[PDB]
């Protein structure tokens, strides 16, 4: 396990905003009734460990709940939390360059219902044929949905699955992480 180089690294918290930053990372959290992560930019995704010297709220942190995984330079921090979401082990981290936020992917809807599949590897909103998957679900997640945006389009959090996944043999053309 390598630690991330901390020469250009920074962390800062003020009135309603907290930022863990690097050369290529920008992880922004905010307070609305709760401190929680809100947006995150990755020029390049790396494999080092974020040092706790530059980490806010680093006590009592569950690895299962850090949105950005520890093995991918995720700060071990309660600022790295989002209610209704667990660690994004199988997000679209292969994109290299991506933006993560909480908003709907273009042309799609997300509803909270237990009539949904369990969480799994993140899925692109367009299939391998390019068809758009409109309706999405989550068992126990919170809205707005966890969203990734990258060169090949928009992806959803592990918790978010196609509402009609069991229909039309959708699984055969899904684009997955």
């Amino acid at each position, epitope marked *: 396990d390598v630690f991330c180089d901390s020469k250009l690294m920074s962390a800062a918290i003020k009135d309603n905003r907290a930022v863990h930053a690097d050369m290529g990372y920008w992880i922004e959290s905010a307070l609305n009734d709760t401190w929680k992560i809100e947006k995150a930019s990755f020029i390049e995704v790396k494999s080092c460990h974020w040092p706790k010297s530059h980490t806010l709220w680093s006590n009592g942190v569950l690895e299962s709940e850090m949105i950005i995984p520890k093995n991918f330079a995720g700060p071990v921090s309660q600022h790295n939390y989002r209610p209704g979401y667990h660690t994004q082990t199988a997000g679209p981290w292969h994109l290299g360059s991506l933006e993560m936020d909480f908003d709907f992917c*273009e*042309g799609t809807t997300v509803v909270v219902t237990e009539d949904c599949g369990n969480r799994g590897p993140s899925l692109r909103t367009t*299939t*391998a*044929s*390019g*068809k758009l998957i409109t309706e999405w679900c989550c068992r126990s997640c919170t809205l707005p949905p966890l969203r990734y945006r990258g*060169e090949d*389009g928009c992806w959803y959090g592990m918790e978010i699955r196609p509402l009609k996944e069991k229909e039309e043999n959708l699984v*055969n053309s899904l684009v997955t992480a």
Partner: antibody
Amino acid sequence: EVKLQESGPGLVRPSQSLSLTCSVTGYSITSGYYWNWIRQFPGNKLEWMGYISYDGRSNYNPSLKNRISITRDTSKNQFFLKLNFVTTEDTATYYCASFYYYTSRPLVYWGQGTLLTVSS
Amino acid sequence: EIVLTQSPASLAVSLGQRATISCRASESVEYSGTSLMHWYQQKPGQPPKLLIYAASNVESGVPARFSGSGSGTDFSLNIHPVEEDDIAMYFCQQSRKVPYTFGGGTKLELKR
């Protein structure tokens, strides 16, 4: 989901210009897909005419290079096909279509098509 | 321009039997191990509808009686067992090079 719909006149006089509209619903034309125009002649032959990218760059079939122009209106979520001139050989059914750029690029979406007759 | 030749132009077929349509490209359509060739069905008064993408992948929602095969310059669409709903026109299309081009079409007609 994504729907395409063509619109325009069903009848245009020879040697006059031609303007076709494709209205896109359920997805913004500024991401994901390339937006193409394809026509089908009475004998069922299909000819790909051109596309405009989600970043607004067009690419045209050489058979039409000097008479074709594909533009877009992002505020109305439409794109447009223009022929500087038409003859009676351009009588055909004109379709709008799209393919997702980061795929093998099959034409997954088509409009209903609009009949265009070129006659005097 | 990549020229696609479809064969035959018209195919007579019995319900329940196997139908095979061929499309041959003038140059290779492959790109990084993927064959950039697609198959469409068209009914009268309707736009073409995607049946097979990348020349062996059945589109979601397309019945299992459709299949695709081939590589390089030679490709095949396969329908078995043929049903009444399959009496229609079929087209191949290449996306390996611009300008994109279609095959001349194949009419699947009922045999008698």
